[PDB]
Structure formats: C-alpha cells, structure tokens
UniProtKB/Swiss-Prot annotation, chains A, B:
Selectivity filter part 3 as annotated region, ranges: 297-302
Protein name per its UniProtKB record: Trk system potassium uptake protein TrkH
Highest classification ranks of the organism: Bacteria, Pseudomonadati, Pseudomonadota, Gammaproteobacteria, Vibrionales
Any one GO MF annotation of this record: potassium channel activity
Family membership: Belongs to the TrkH potassium transport family.
C-alpha cells in the first residue's frame, strides 16, 4: 500500500497549489479593488502544510495507490481550495458554502452558491475562474498521467507538456477573440478560463447574458466544440504538420459527437420555431445553437432562461447532458464513446434475440471490442444509474423537493451547473446537507463513478 | 414467416375471449343492477370476428412467430377487451379512455381513468376485475407456454392445467378470506381477482380504503406476497404433498425477495415512526407493512394517500417499484432475479478493477452464469432505462408536466399504477395522446421491453 510515498505527492501538490495563489493575488494589487489578503495567507498555510508533508518523506516507491492518488488530488485540492472563500470577508459566506464553491469550481462542475458576484473583488472573481482552469488541467493530464500509476489499458510524460500547449494556445487564442468581440480584458481572460475547461463559471451573475452579441455566443460555441473534444485527438496538431483534416473524421467517436450535436441542435431550433418561442427566427437560431452546445457538452453557460421554451426542450437538454465530450476531454458525462458503445452493444443484444445461434461482434473502427470492456461499459452505465437515484434520494431526504433534487443530481453528476429542470436552478439557499451531498455527487461525477466506489469495497484493502 | 397460421391462433383467441363475456353478463342478470346489453353484444362481435379468422385458415404450421404471437395476444386482446367499455353508456367514456381502461386492465397495470366507479353496474365492475384475473393468467402461463413457440432457455403442457390449479385455489382461497373479514361476496371475489393477479383494480374508488381493518390490509399483504412469488416455485405444491418448506429458502431468488421486502418495510415503518406521521405506533405498522408490499410487488393497492408521509417514502417506494416479483409471477418490474444478478455483475466489475488478472465468476445457486445471459441482463437494464426516458419525453411533449410524466412512466412501465410521486396521481383527465403513450408504456412493461423492441428492428424481417 505504502501511503508513506503517496503523502509525498500530496504535500508536493499542496506546494504546487500554493504557487497558484500568487496568481489571483497578482490581481489583488493590479486591479485596485477589494481584498487579496486571504490569497497571500493561503499561499503560506498551503506551502507550509504541503512542505510539512513532502519533507518528512522523500521516498519514490514508484494499482491500489493510483486510485487513492486520483481521489486525493481532488479531495485534498478541492478542500484546500475552499480557504480563500473562508478568510475573505468580501463575499463572506458559510464554511459549507465555501466548500461547495471550491469543489464546484475545481471539478469544473460550475454551480455557484454565491449570489451577487457581479459586485465583488476582481480577485475573488479571478480565483473563481482560475480554479476552473486549473482543474481543467487535471481532467486532461489525468487522461495521460494515470497510465504510470493506474490503467486505462489495464482494463510518455512527453505529452504532459505537449498537452499544456494545446490548452494554453486555446485559452489565449480564445481570450483574444472574446476581447475582440469586446469584453473587458479581465472578463475575456476569465471567460476563456471557463470556456476552455468547459466549466460554466462566469463573472456576470447571468453568465453569458452580458452582451447578447451573437459574436460572443457563437464564439463560445466554437471554442466549446473545440474544447469538448479529446485532447489526444487534438494532439494531431503539435505533432508536426497541421495535418489535422483527416484525423478527426477518422475516429468514429468524434464523428458521433458531431452527429449528436447536429441532431440535438436541429430538433431544438425547429421546435423553437414551430412554437414561436422567439420573435425573430434568427434569435431562435442563436439561442438554440448556443443552448444545445453549451448544455449537452457539460458546459453550463446560459444565454436564456427558457422563458418561451417548451418544457420538452430543457428536459431533453438536461437528458442529453448525460452525453457530453469526446472521451478524455474537459467534459464529463458518461462520455460519448460510452453511449456509442452502449447503443452498439444493445443493438447486438436485439439482434441475438432473432438469430441466437449466430456470432455477432462489436465493431468500432476496424478492430472488434473485447468482451471485457463491453462488460465494463454496461457495468458503468448501471453504476451510474445507481449513484444518480441514490443521491436523488439523498437530496429528497436532505429536505429538498422531488424535481429539484432530480435536477440537482442530474446537474452535479454530469457536472453541469444549471438547475435546468423547471426553473429551479439556484443553489445558494438550498439545504446545507444538500450542499454536502451535491459535493459528493460532483466528486462521483468527476471520478467516473468507479474509481471512488471501489474505495469502499473490502476488496480494495489490502 | 407464415402469418397464415398465426391468424388461426388469433381468431381462436378472439373466440376464447368471447366465451368470457358471458361471465360478467351473468352478473348483469344476477345482480339486478345496471346494463349488460354490451357484454352480450361483445360476446357476439368477438365470436364472429374470431371465427371469421379461425375458419378461413385451419393450418397448424407449428421464433419470430413466437414473438409476433406474444405481441398479438396482448395487442389484440387488449383492444378487443375495450368493447364493453364502449357500447355501455353507464360509465359513458371516450374511446381512448376505453382503450386505456382495457389495456390497463388486461396488463394487470391497474390504473383507472374512470372516477366514481363506486356507483356503477355490478357487471361493468366485475368485467373490470375479471379482465385483470384473465390477464393474470396470461402473465404466468406465458412463463410456460412460450417455450414451444419461443425461447426462455433459447437465451410441458403438463403444467398448463397444473398452474391454473395453483391460481384457482388461490383466488378462491382468498375470496373466502376476504369475505371472512367481511366484504360483500361480490367485493370479496372481485378483490381476490385483483389481489392474486397483482393488478390493483378495485370496486371502491379508494381501493383498500373501505374498512381500515388491519384484517383485510394484512390479508391483502399475505396473499400479495404469495401471488407475487414464482408459480413454478409454487409448483412444488401439487407435486407430492406439502413438502413446500425447503424449496423456498433454497432458491436464492426468493431468498432475496424476502430480504428486499423486509428491509423496505423496516425503513418505511421506522421513518413513519420517527416523523410522528401516525397517531398510534400501530397504524404506522399497518400502513407501512401494507404500502411497501403493495407498491413494491407491483400490486398498486393503496390504503393511504401519503398525507403525513415524509416525501422520501413515496419516492423510495416508487423506485422500489422497479423490482417487484419473483421471476415468472404476476408482478412485472425488472423482476427480482434481474436486480440480484445486476448487483452481482456490478460487484464483479468492481472486483476486476482491483485485481484485473483474476478470474471472477457470477454465482447464483451453484453453477455460474454464462457470459451470454449476463450480457442479456445488462442489455435489458439499459433498454429499460432507454424506454423509460423515451416515454417520459413523449409525455412531457404530449403536454404533461415534468414530475407527472415521470411518475406516469414509472407507474406504467412497471404496471403499478398509482401516481405516487407528489400527489398528482389521477389519469382520468390527463392529455388524450398521453393516454395512448401510457398504453404503449404498459405494453412495453408487460412484454419485458425486448420482445416488442425487436419487432421494429429491420433484422426481424425476414
Ligand atoms: K460544467
Ligand atoms: K398492478
């Protein structure tokens, strides 16, 4: 087991986290407004705690450890990251609310309990976006860095930098475009933070409701679509050539993400027209395209409130939220390939009933899928259902009413952010226990459900 | 394919159905009350249509036919059985309402759209119960009769009579007991019809709310539990003497059904106590014990309205509605063995993550399950979820609101069918399209989802 060498990495990570508190404290002296005293207190207590772990250890005793690591990386960082939200009496908020905000930020869930954030320190807002960006690193270097500790192919740090490039040259390349459709520079850095990590956080209390310019809406769209799609596939970029064209339409995962996106928008738009839910058919186009792309790819950004929207639309959207993101992106539904595979496998299951003496094989690209991963997919989907209904009961038990709890889990297990059900979105004054439960829900939502469930099976130890 | 020999059995069934219209027409002349003109009109149009099918055929050209038949037996009979509810202007009701009532009746769904049935002809009420009883035959002789046409073991009419005996000596043995806790004989036969076929229909508009005597509540409980339990397992009754005892606690399906029932009751009761939802700690026991068994074993009978019940309870009940009935009984959730197996399979999936080079096998009784049935189970669960969310969308689109459509599907896909969500139960005045949707929902719910799904795959033909 050797937790003694695991704690080395934990403390090392706390120090590495401390060196990111100097990032919105450098906005606590730049932008004149508010208080950044906490951020510099935090940079201290964290560096101290972390190094108080790293130093009494120093042992690289390089399975059961890998999981425990990728649960500590969140459980600790998302806990430590609730410290600015505590000492700071600028948005003075409850400890549980602080935790909810920190975890929701770090998970790239994006569901706030701080109302009235439009008028707060330019730092405590920047921290909010920076968290999303930073966790948005984890969620994609953990689609590579796990291999040494864990198994994807158990079911190379060449790409640790090479990914950070695709990420940086995306947030920057977005910031320019955002501030070219005219946000304040601050808002265009802090909204690329949110839009690339597919998180949903904003500076405006109405998210993407500042400037109804189809410029920013239809920018957020294309940068979401880019961000919501398989950084290893993007990796056909720095790998010299810019021979992008064919690689995307090669992989059937992406091909499916595109069919899904198209169909979903199409139906949404067409119903928004049929229903006369928008004055101009153009605004219908806008709001439809932005809402489907944002909500289904696990983004969270809202440009409307579904005022004129037929209930069928926010419901079907909250459902399509279960399928968002080429696997190994910054999204976090039961990722696209999961649904692809699922439909394939079930299709088979329907075929076998007809001719049962027949040999049907699951075909993805060319090679067949093994009956060890099909089992894994099905088991995952089931587990997902379990977790969802369990936390739905947990919320109804917390005190919450039925539909609000349904929306809540459906928003924290996919890591959405919006209530999205029947305009019951706002978490601020929800039950406290509910806040904790929902935090759990988004920890599950991040760890793809299994790598936490196994933590409490006896079989894990030892 | 040869549909030509299929029509023989279809018409033969319309005639066999005609000769059961003389059964509540024999109550339209016995009990002085009401109008039985329809039942004798129906006995004619049905005998005529049926024989107009059987006669121009006569060919016993003894898979895909087995399926097409076991969809015809419901789709045809449940349509034909909507004929009394049409011509009769005593509860004069819309055609779609008539179909809803007939299909819900024959399915053992148990969800009425006729409010105020307390004051109706003693025949049209008896027809309502008789339907449930007759379908309650189908749902258990199709756990035998299918084998020649189809496959359970593709994934003997010795027992065709032998089942009808365990069924008859149960409805009779219940009718007596009901009329010994003092119902009118009519109400004690027509409630054994419903309580054995696990259907949920009643004579009283408040179902089991006539006489809050724990006598009848705790009779209905004990006859539900028996009826809700594996007639093939019961078959250890007529064969040899009363050597029942060991057989039950041998089979782990039943062994699981008992744990489930107990745990469910326990939590329910204990919460009805903690919440002070009942004046005396006796009525708490009563209502808990009756409600868990009724709602979870797919019965439908209600003795309360969940006035003081903590919301957590009707919700958890509506969910436990998904798993009800020893497999091959009169229930119709995703039957108990399914959930047992599912949990086993997922537990396994959770084990493989830890030690991945290991050989884990699924164990039920003694022999392991083959990896052709685990696949089938998982596929079934997935399909189930799919169907549910699809019909929930179909209903939210029909016009219904979100939570109501949810309760509706969750009640018709398992065949409960009380609303049960947050006191929005009553189907009578729901949208008209929605009624059709719900009929589909309960056809799926009856046919275990696959054996109708495959009917619309191209692969089925030919
Ligand atoms: K999000
Ligand atoms: K029922």
């Amino acid at each position: 087991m050797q937790f003694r060498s695991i704690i080395r990495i934990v403390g090392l990570l706390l120090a590495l986290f401390s060196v990111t508190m100097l990032a919105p404290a450098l906005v606590a002296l730049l932008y004149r407004d508010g208080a950044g005293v906490p951020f510099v207190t935090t940079f201290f207590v964290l560096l101290f705690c972390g190094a108080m772990c790293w130093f009494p250890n120093r042992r690289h005793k390089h399975s059961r450890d890998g999981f425990l690591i990728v649960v500590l990386f969140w459980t600790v960082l998302g806990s430590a990251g609730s410290l600015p939200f505590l000492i700071a009496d600028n948005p003075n908020i409850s400890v549980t609310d602080a935790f909810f905000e920190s975890f929701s930020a770090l998970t790239t869930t994006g569901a706030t309990v701080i109302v009235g954030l439009d008028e707060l320190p330019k730092a405590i807002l920047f921290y909010r976006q920076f968290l999303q960006w930073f966790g948005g690193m984890g969620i994609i270097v953990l689609a590579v860095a796990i291999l040494p500790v864990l198994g994807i192919g158990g079911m190379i740090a060449e790409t640790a930098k090479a990914l950070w490039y695709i990420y940086l040259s995306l947030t920057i390349a977005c910031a320019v475009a955002f501030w070219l459709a005219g946000m304040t520079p601050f808002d265009a850095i802090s909204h690329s933070f949110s839009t690339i990590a597919i998180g949903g956080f904003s500076t405006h209390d109405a998210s993407m409701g500042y400037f109804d310019s189809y410029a920013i809406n239809l920018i957020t769209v294309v940068f979401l679509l880019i961000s919501a799609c398989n950084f290893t596939l993007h990796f056909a970029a720095f790998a010299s050539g810019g021979v992008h064209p064919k690689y995307y339409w090669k992989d059937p995962e992406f091909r499916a993400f595109i069919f899904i996106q198209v169909l979903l928008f199409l139906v949404c738009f067409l119903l928004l027209l049929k229903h006369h839910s928008y004055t101009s058919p153009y605004d219908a186009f806008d709001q439809a395209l932005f809402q489907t792309v944002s909500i289904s790819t696990t983004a969270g950004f809202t440009t409307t409130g579904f005022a004129d929207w037929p209930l069928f639309l926010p419901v079907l959207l909250l459902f399509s939220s279960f399928i968002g993101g080429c696997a190994g992106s910054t999204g976090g539904g039961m990722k696209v390939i999961r649904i692809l595979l699922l439909t394939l496998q079930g299709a088979r299951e329907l075929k076998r009933l007809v001719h049962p003496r027949a040999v049907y094989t699951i075909k993805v690209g060319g090679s067949a899928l093994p009956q060890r991963v099909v089992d894994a997919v099905w088991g995952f989907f089931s587990a997902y259902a379990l977790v969802f209904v369990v936390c739905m009961l947990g919320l109804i038990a917390t005190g919450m009413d039925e539909l609000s709890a349904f929306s809540a889990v459906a928003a924290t297990l996919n890591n959405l952010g919006p209530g999205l059900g029947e305009v019951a979105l706002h978490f601020g004054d929800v039950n406290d226990k509910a806040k904790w439960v929902l935090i759990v829900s988004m920890l599950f939502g991040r760890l793809e459900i299994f790598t936490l469930l196994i933590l409490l099976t006896p079989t894990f130890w030892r």
